[PDB]
Amino acid sequence: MEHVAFGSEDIENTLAKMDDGQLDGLAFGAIQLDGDGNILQYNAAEGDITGRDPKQVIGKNFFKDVAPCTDSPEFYGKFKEGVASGNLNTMFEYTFDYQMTPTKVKVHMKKALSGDSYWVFVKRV
Numbered sequence: 001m002e003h004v005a006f007g008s009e010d011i012e013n014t015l016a017k018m019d020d021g022q023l024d025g026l027a028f029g030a031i032q033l034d035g036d037g038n039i040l041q042y043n044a045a046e047g048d049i050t051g052r053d054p055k056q057v058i059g060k061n062f063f064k065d066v067a068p069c070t071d072s073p074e075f076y077g078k079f080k081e082g083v084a085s086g087n088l089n090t091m092f093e094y095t096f097d098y099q100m101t102p103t104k105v106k107v108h109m110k111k112a113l114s115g116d117s118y119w120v121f122v123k124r125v
């Protein structure tokens with residue numbers, strides 16, 4: 001395992017050192033998005049939660065293509081305000097229900113330490 005707790009205050013500094021292989025050792029799902037919502041990184045734990053194959057969703061748009069259930073003011077709306085503002089740090093519960101059994105999760109969205117990238121972290125509840 002990589003030992004990093006979900007919700008940790010300095011998580012963006014810790015994850016700045018990991019490559020795709022290290023990200024697969026986290027105890028929670030991790031997605032890195034660009035400012036348009038395209039998927040740059042997608043770890044093994046996220047694929048275990050949602051059924052998606054990580055290598056197949058990299059490059060797709062999360063809000064348009066992969067996760068239309070998140071295209072709502074409650075999820076995408078928060079993301080886009082964060083990108084526009086250049087700051088984002090929010091945690092909320094959500095249900096993922098597209099082409100899968102409805103699954104309740106906790107989501108943490110946080111701006112990355114690098115400029116135009118954003119993390120989405122997911123764990124079951």
Ligand SMILES: *C(=O)/C=C/c1ccc(O)cc1
Pocket residue numbers: 046050052066067068069070095096097098
């Ligand atoms: C709603 O459409 C949610 C879909 C979804 C969430 C998270 C993922 O990693 C993949 C699909």
